[PDB]
């Protein structure tokens, strides 16, 4: 169950990946197969409907593989579809965790500055972009752009005061995020927001995998490649605060709403961590891979 927001012939649509290299237009499929119109037009609204939307989508895929002659209405080959971020316009800023991998904390010069409590900041929705999109280099405000491959969690059911025991029941699914950061701007304003919120600096996608397809988030692996070179490799089992601990902490006095996006922190290997620091430049290709979500690819603009 992989969901996406695709664009094809001037139509933005909520899509479900069929068998890899095909994508189903859920609204159009519902009208032709189920004769009805009940699927909303954005993925964040579908997430609000929770499990019943997901099951509705599976039934639609099942009926579509059954013989019929309407497939041309709603079956698109992925090669012909531009994938936006699964949630192109979040309702709120992306919630981000800092220094959630021990090695990355050390990398930024700490081992004393390993947080004992989640360090949490946000990225403005104006940073959100999709698979294959060009990230503005922002040469004018910074010469220290950095990449951050991260696993992202999307809340699928609202709640406050959520226990770590109930946390996964408030999760819709998982996607990839590149937390692109201006390291100089990060120091300048002392709060991470401005250096984390430059335009286009949050690639997200390529798809949003429902949690029912990832039973063990602990085993996911994040791999970041810059110009083909492996530079990050981290296991979600090694992050200091687990996803249920993060949800319990984030929601202690704050309501998490369906569609909220949580970036759980990048592993070691970021560009600033190299002696002879490696910063991003125009033309750098960035590939982040988390199976079974896929690979999120972006280029820094030239």
The one among 30, 146, 150, 260 contacting ligand OXL by CB under 6 A: 150
8 A C-beta contact, residue 3 and residue 14: yes
8 A C-beta contact, residue 86 and residue 204: yes
For position 133 contacting ligand OXL by CB under 6 A, the verdict is no
Q: How far is the CB of 98 from its own copies (least distance, A)?
A: 7
Is residue 259 helix, strand or coil?
coil
47 contact choice in its own copies, Mn ion, ligand OXL, none (CB below 5 to 8 Å, kind-dependent) = none
Q: Which residue is nearest to Mn ion (CB)?
A: 179
User: From CA 59, how far away is CA 137, in angstroms rounded?
Assistant: 43
End-to-end CA distance of the chain, in Å? 36
Question: SS3 sequence, 149-196?
Answer: EEEEEEECCCECCCCCCCHHHHEEEEEEEECCEEHHHHHHHCCCHHHH
193 contact choice in Mn ion, ligand OXL, its own copies, none (CB below 5 to 8 Å, kind-dependent) = its own copies
Per-position x/- string for 262-281, each x denoting binding to Mn ion as judged by CB under 5 A, each - no binding? ----x---------------
8 A C-beta contact, residue 153 and residue 167: no
- Say which residue the tokens 């990050």 belong to: 232
The one among 266, 268, 297, 298 contacting ligand OXL by CB under 6 A: 266
For position 104 contacting ligand OXL by CB under 6 A, the verdict is yes
For position 148 contacting ligand OXL by CB under 6 A, the verdict is yes
For position 107 contacting ligand OXL by CB under 6 A, the verdict is no
The binding site for Mn ion (CB under 5 A) comprises: 148, 179, 266
The binding site for ligand OXL (CB under 6 A) comprises: 96, 98-100, 104, 148, 150, 179, 265-266
């Amino acid at each position: 169950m992989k969901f996406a927001t695709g664009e094809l012939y001037n139509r933005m649509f909520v899509g479900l990946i069929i068998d890899d290299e095909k994508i189903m237009d859920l609204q159009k499929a519902e009208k032709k197969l189920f004769e009805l119109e009940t699927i909303p037009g954005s993925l964040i609204e579908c997430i609000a409907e929770g499990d019943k939307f997901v099951a509705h989508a599976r039934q639609l895929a099942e009926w579509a593989k059954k013989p019929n002659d309407e497939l041309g209405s709603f079956m698109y080959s992925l090669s012909e579809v531009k994938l936006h971020a699964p949630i192109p316009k979040p309702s709120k800023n992306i919630i981000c965790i800092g220094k959630n991998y021990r090695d990355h904390a050390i990398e930024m010069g700490s081992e004393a500055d390993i947080p004992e409590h989640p360090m949490v900041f946000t990225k403005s929705p104006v940073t959100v972009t999709g698979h294959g999109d060009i990230v503005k280099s922002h040469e004018e405000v910074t010469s220290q752009l950095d990449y951050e491959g991260e696993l992202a969690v999307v809340i699928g059911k609202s709640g406050t005061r959520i226990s770590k025991e109930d946390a996964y029941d408030h999760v819709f699914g998982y996607t990839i995020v590149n937390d692109i950061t201006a390291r100089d701007l990060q120091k300048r304003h002392k709060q991470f927001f401005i250096g984390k919120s430059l335009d286009t600096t949050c690639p997200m996608g390529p798809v949003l995998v429902h949690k029912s397809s990832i039973q063990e988030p602990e085993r996911l692996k994040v791999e970041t490649r810059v110009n083909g070179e492996l530079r990050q490799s981290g296991s979600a089992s090694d992050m200091i605060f687990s996803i249920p601990e993060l949800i319990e902490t984030l929601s202690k006095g704050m309501t998490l709403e369906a569609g909220d996006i949580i970036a759980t922190g990048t592993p070691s290997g970021v560009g600033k961590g190299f002696t002879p620091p490696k910063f991003l430049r125009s033309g750098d290709k960035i590939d982040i891979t988390i199976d079974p979500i896929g690979t999120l690819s972006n280029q820094i603009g030239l």
